[PDB]
Symmetry: C3
Subunit: 207 residues, 3 copies
């Protein structure tokens, strides 16, 4: 628990955390410490579990990222971090292309190779994973996850906590409900309700 | 209709125009005005419909981009713009990787995150949309459209006005006819004639 | 056979070589000569077939790249080049994003637009082709080939000489055997043994 002055605290110490750490460092940020439910990751010390958050705040650390893949859990831990007095930073790799008219929330991960086009809105705690494409006028709800190499054409809306697997695609104007999962490679050609799983080319709901 | 000296005139004021405007600005270009069939877009004034083109030319504007998604219409409006004395510029996002041996036409859109490899030829008025990949020795006909996150392997030929939906893929050496549509996610494994629709993995013509 | 002092020798003079040459030049390297079984490519002289390798070495050239698409042949020619006293360079386009914790072998091609994330290991003579994504903690065996716009999620292992076609996708934690082929667009959702062909969404072994 001895730490430097000023860096970012990470909740989570798994594979997703490794990628987030590297995005932060590529921007010139310092990663101070990890809290993990199993109480180092790429040279960052694991200092305890989430009970260590008050201690970290008291010692002057005030900036945090939630590096947890599970969308519902990430959302819950973001709220906890904010309650403890932390501000949620963004982890945006410098190679990502984020249009100047994009609206970004807080606690957002944007991985290497991403492109996000004009007038898209990205909710708090979203993940836009490696190589993903978000075209113009999209709306991404809080804590959703666009997996690696996924792509949204224009005017797509993605509900809170929805998850699109590696290489999923969505055609223009479609709306996907909250808590829905699109399997890897699924090609979504019609609106999806909340709380379903859809797979295939074209994607079809699986009961 | 009062405008600055020197910028680019845009035909079209929709979603595609927004993305094109941002590519142009990312390169340091100034966008002077829009003409739209409904007579501002990201701060660019809409000054009239296409009947305003002579007026614009007379006031010294001579550079133009056709930001219209529909391929046949785009092609027609490009010809009209040239007849009115405009030169068609290219709108190439600075993040796109365009090989030094690529041959580019005029009025071409190349969005963020694109890669185009050696000895590919890109016809006038083509769109190479966000994140798309064009491998070596490809031939893209005038006014075709490679949609977001689409990919052509080596030696692929795409006919005039053809359209490949989001995430379409084409294997090496295939030829796709003029006016053909490949649905989102379609994986083209054999030559396609002119004026067909093909969908699926592998892509199959739908009557 | 008169050449400059210091550049890279290329085995192979086909389409793949063109792309490799351009990656090398984008990095500031000089390409000295090609050896090809048919005894210029983008301005690089073809000086003979592989029997010219001793001659090249004797004249002071010591750096080489094997620009051959076929994985088994590439692997064989890499061994031959090393036996003749050449060091195998890497051909990594400057636009590729290679994480600082990635382990790279020798003779590796990494094309434009690629992203490779944390703690991935890339075997000698691998090809990571245009726009491909390799997420965290992946293991790519010697002489494998990830085709254009392909994507591996986290923790994927790819065997020696395996080949993933354009736009193939692999979900987290999957292992693909040596010498296996995944067709274009295939979405791999379960481990694959050695020496099979798998196609489709989801990918299925074809006898
Ligand atoms: C669709 C998915 C959620 C199913 O998970 P699951 O229900 O645990 O599925 P299983 O692995 O048991 O497979 C159940 C069945 O679905 C099929 N299937 C699995 N994934 C599929 C996919 N993406 N597309 C089409 N079919 C799929 C299987 O072939 C199997 O078929 P069967 O009943 O003929 O045996 C999952 O396979 C998937 O695609 N996850 C996305 C993961 C991802 O991309 N992560 C990236 C993290 S950044
Ligand atoms: C293929 C396509 C052209 C069909 O358009 P459409 O004929 O208006 O089709 P509909 O939405 O009425 O769907 C007709 C049928 O095709 C199926 N389908 C639609 N798109 C499909 C696709 N891409 N792949 C496979 N099947 C598809 C539907 O499930 C429906 O099946 P059904 O008869 O069982 O109900 C269109 O869905 C598409 O893929 N457009 C590409 C758009 C795009 O990517 N734009 C990017 C702009 S930059
Ligand atoms: C799968 C593959 C290896 C098959 O090659 P092949 O056996 O010579 O196949 P053919 O072209 O004769 O097609 C055999 C059959 O497979 C089907 N098919 C071919 N490729 C397919 C694919 N990728 N996915 C699904 N089906 C496919 C065909 O429609 C045909 O079906 P049929 O028996 O109904 O006529 C090949 O088509 C492929 O995908 N190659 C990947 C190439 C690539 O991406 N290169 C990039 C280089 S960097
Ligand atoms: C590209 C890709 O496939 N990325 C995947 C990755 O492959 C994994 O499937 C997954 O990454 P994640 O890093 O979340 O999972 P894992 O590697 O299993 O690590 C989860 C970490 O979270 C920790 N953890 C879980 N619950 C909590 C919790 O409540 N609090 C804290 N502080 N840590 C927690 C857990 O102990 C573990 O170290 O999700 C990502 C989206
Ligand atoms: C990534 C993506 O999905 N992009 C799509 C996008 O989502 C749309 O589906 C579509 O974009 P486009 O901008 O062409 O469409 P829309 O947003 O509908 O705007 C078309 C504009 O063109 C105008 N227009 C149509 N006909 C003409 C015409 O004849 N002349 C002029 N000057 N303008 C015209 C029309 O008034 C409108 O403002 O095409 C793109 C390829
Ligand atoms: C993006 C894409 O589709 N790339 C493909 C590309 O489209 C081709 O299908 C293929 O490229 P490659 O350049 O290997 O193939 P090709 O264009 O046919 O050229 C092979 C070259 O290797 C030469 N060659 C073959 N065997 C040998 C050999 O034994 N030694 C030497 N020195 N050269 C050899 C042959 O003479 C020819 O010039 O593989 C790539 C992965
Ligand atoms: Cl650090
Ligand atoms: Cl359905
Ligand atoms: Cl402007
Ligand atoms: Cl067919
Ligand atoms: Cl050179
Ligand atoms: Cl199978």
């Amino acid at each position: 628990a001895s730490l430097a002055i000023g860096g970012v605290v990470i909740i989570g110490g798994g594979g997703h955390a490794k990628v987030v750490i590297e995005s932060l460092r590529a921007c010139g940020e310092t990663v101070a410490a990890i809290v993990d439910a199993d109480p180092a990751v790429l040279g960052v010390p694991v200092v305890g579990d989430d009970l260590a958050l008050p201690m970290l705040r008291e010692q002057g650390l005030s900036r945090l990222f939630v590096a947890i893949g599970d969308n519902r859990l990430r959302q819950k831990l973001g709220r906890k971090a904010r309650d403890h007095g932390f501000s949620l930073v963004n982890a945006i790799h410098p190679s990502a292309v984020v249009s100047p008219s994009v609206r970004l929330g807080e606690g957002v991960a944007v991985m290497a190779g991403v492109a996000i086009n004009a007038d898209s809105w990205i909710g708090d705690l979203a993940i836009i994973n490696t190589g993903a494409v978000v075209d113009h006028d999209c709306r991404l709800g809080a804590a959703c996850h666009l997996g690696p190499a996924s792509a949204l054409a224009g005017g797509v809306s993605v509900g809170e906590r929805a998850f699109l697997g590696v290489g999923a695609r969505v055609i223009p104007g479609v709306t996907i409900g909250a808590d829905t999962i699109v399997g890897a490679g699924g090609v979504v050609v019609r609106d999806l309700p909340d709380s379903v799983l859809a797979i295939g080319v074209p994607a079809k709901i699986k009961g």
